[PDB]
From a paper:
Although pharmacologically intriguing, AT118i4h32 is highly polyreactive in the PSR assay and has a high pI value (9.6), which is characteristic of polyreactive antibodies. Furthermore, a crystal structure of AT118i4h32 displays large patches of positive charge on the protein surface and enrichment of both solvent exposed arginine and hydrophobic residues in the CDR regions. We analyzed the sequence of AT118i4h32 and selected twelve single amino acid substitutions scattered throughout each CDR predicted to reduce polyreactivity based on the one-hot logistic regression model. AT118i4h32 variants were displayed on the surface of yeast and all showed reduced levels of PSR binding. Neutralizing the highly basic patch composed of R3035, R3136, and R99108 on the surface of AT118i4h32 with R31D36 and R99D108 substitutions substantially reduces AT118i4h32 polyreactivity. Notably, introduction of an additional arginine residue with the Y29R30 substitution, which introduces a RRR sequence motif into CDR1, reduces polyreactivity, further demonstrating that arginine’s contribution to polyreactivity is position-dependent, which is captured through our machine learning models. In addition, our success in reducing polyreactivity of AT118i4h32, where the humanized framework region differs from clones in the training set, indicates that our methods are applicable to nanobodies from a range of sources and can be fully integrated with existing computational tools to reduce immunogenicity.
Residue numbers in the entry: 0 to 119
The structure:
Protein backbone atom coordinates (compact mmCIF):
# COMPACT_ATOMS: atom_id res chain seq x y z
CA UNK A 1 0.00 0.00 0.00
CA UNK A 2 1.16 3.54 -0.80
CA UNK A 3 2.15 5.88 2.03
CA UNK A 4 2.24 9.59 1.22
CA UNK A 5 1.66 12.86 3.09
CA UNK A 6 1.27 16.15 1.19
CA UNK A 7 1.24 19.42 3.14
CA UNK A 8 0.44 22.93 1.92
CA UNK A 9 -1.09 26.22 3.00
CA UNK A 10 1.80 27.86 4.84
CA UNK A 11 3.28 31.28 4.29
CA UNK A 12 3.49 34.76 5.77
CA UNK A 13 0.61 36.51 7.54
CA UNK A 14 0.17 39.48 9.87
CA UNK A 15 -0.43 39.03 13.61
CA UNK A 16 -4.07 38.30 14.28
CA UNK A 17 -4.42 36.82 10.79
CA UNK A 18 -5.56 33.42 9.58
CA UNK A 19 -3.88 30.54 7.76
CA UNK A 20 -5.23 27.12 6.80
CA UNK A 21 -2.88 24.14 6.64
CA UNK A 22 -3.80 20.97 4.77
CA UNK A 23 -2.38 17.44 4.74
CA UNK A 24 -3.61 15.09 2.02
CA UNK A 25 -2.90 11.49 3.05
CA UNK A 26 -3.25 8.27 1.10
CA UNK A 27 -6.42 6.37 1.97
CA UNK A 28 -4.40 3.71 3.79
CA UNK A 29 -3.42 6.37 6.33
CA UNK A 30 -6.44 8.69 6.39
CA UNK A 31 -8.81 5.89 7.44
CA UNK A 32 -7.06 4.02 10.27
CA UNK A 33 -4.35 6.39 11.55
CA UNK A 34 -4.21 9.09 14.19
CA UNK A 35 -3.07 12.28 12.44
CA UNK A 36 -1.56 15.22 14.30
CA UNK A 37 0.10 18.55 13.59
CA UNK A 38 3.46 19.47 15.12
CA UNK A 39 5.53 22.65 14.85
CA UNK A 40 9.21 23.45 15.37
CA UNK A 41 10.28 27.05 15.87
CA UNK A 42 13.90 28.03 15.12
CA UNK A 43 16.05 27.00 18.08
CA UNK A 44 13.59 24.57 19.70
CA UNK A 45 12.21 21.09 19.06
CA UNK A 46 8.94 19.84 17.64
CA UNK A 47 5.91 20.27 19.90
CA UNK A 48 2.34 19.03 19.75
CA UNK A 49 -0.34 21.28 18.23
CA UNK A 50 -3.47 19.24 17.45
CA UNK A 51 -4.53 15.71 16.53
CA UNK A 52 -7.67 13.97 15.30
CA UNK A 53 -9.16 10.60 14.29
CA UNK A 54 -7.82 7.17 15.18
CA UNK A 55 -10.66 6.51 17.62
CA UNK A 56 -9.20 9.08 19.99
CA UNK A 57 -11.00 12.37 20.57
CA UNK A 58 -9.66 15.59 19.09
CA UNK A 59 -6.81 17.03 21.16
CA UNK A 60 -5.18 20.45 21.30
CA UNK A 61 -2.23 22.07 22.99
CA UNK A 62 -3.50 24.48 25.63
CA UNK A 63 -1.71 27.40 23.95
CA UNK A 64 -3.75 26.95 20.74
CA UNK A 65 -7.10 25.67 22.08
CA UNK A 66 -9.89 28.04 21.08
CA UNK A 67 -7.80 29.54 18.26
CA UNK A 68 -6.93 26.49 16.12
CA UNK A 69 -9.38 23.93 14.75
CA UNK A 70 -8.51 20.54 13.27
CA UNK A 71 -10.95 18.73 10.97
CA UNK A 72 -11.28 16.02 8.33
CA UNK A 73 -12.75 15.95 4.81
CA UNK A 74 -13.69 12.45 3.67
CA UNK A 75 -14.13 13.50 0.03
CA UNK A 76 -10.45 14.52 -0.12
CA UNK A 77 -8.68 12.27 2.44
CA UNK A 78 -7.29 15.50 3.89
CA UNK A 79 -6.83 16.83 7.42
CA UNK A 80 -7.03 20.60 7.87
CA UNK A 81 -5.53 22.82 10.58
CA UNK A 82 -7.33 26.16 10.68
CA UNK A 83 -5.20 28.76 12.50
CA UNK A 84 -7.02 31.91 13.63
CA UNK A 85 -5.78 34.78 15.80
CA UNK A 86 -2.18 33.97 14.91
CA UNK A 87 0.66 35.48 16.94
CA UNK A 88 4.42 35.81 16.68
CA UNK A 89 4.96 32.76 18.90
CA UNK A 90 3.23 30.62 16.26
CA UNK A 91 6.14 31.18 13.84
CA UNK A 92 7.46 27.67 13.15
CA UNK A 93 7.73 24.87 10.62
CA UNK A 94 4.47 22.93 10.88
CA UNK A 95 4.68 19.17 10.33
CA UNK A 96 1.80 16.80 9.61
CA UNK A 97 2.20 13.40 11.25
CA UNK A 98 0.43 10.04 11.17
CA UNK A 99 1.04 7.25 13.66
CA UNK A 100 -0.45 4.13 15.21
CA UNK A 101 0.92 2.87 18.52
CA UNK A 102 -0.72 -0.57 18.60
CA UNK A 103 0.86 -2.39 15.65
CA UNK A 104 3.02 -0.02 13.60
CA UNK A 105 6.46 0.79 15.07
CA UNK A 106 6.62 3.77 12.68
CA UNK A 107 5.37 7.35 12.51
CA UNK A 108 5.06 9.07 9.13
CA UNK A 109 6.08 12.72 8.73
CA UNK A 110 5.35 15.32 6.09
CA UNK A 111 8.02 17.53 4.60
CA UNK A 112 7.07 20.59 6.67
CA UNK A 113 5.52 23.93 5.69
CA UNK A 114 6.71 27.31 6.92
CA UNK A 115 4.36 29.62 8.84
CA UNK A 116 5.73 33.12 9.47
CA UNK A 117 3.89 35.77 11.51
CA UNK A 118 5.69 39.09 10.98
CA UNK A 119 4.49 42.58 11.92
CA UNK A 120 4.79 44.48 8.65
Amino acid sequence: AEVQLVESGGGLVQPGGSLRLSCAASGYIYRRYRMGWYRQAPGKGREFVAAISGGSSTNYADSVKGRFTISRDNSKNTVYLQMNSLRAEDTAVYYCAAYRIVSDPRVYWGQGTQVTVSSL
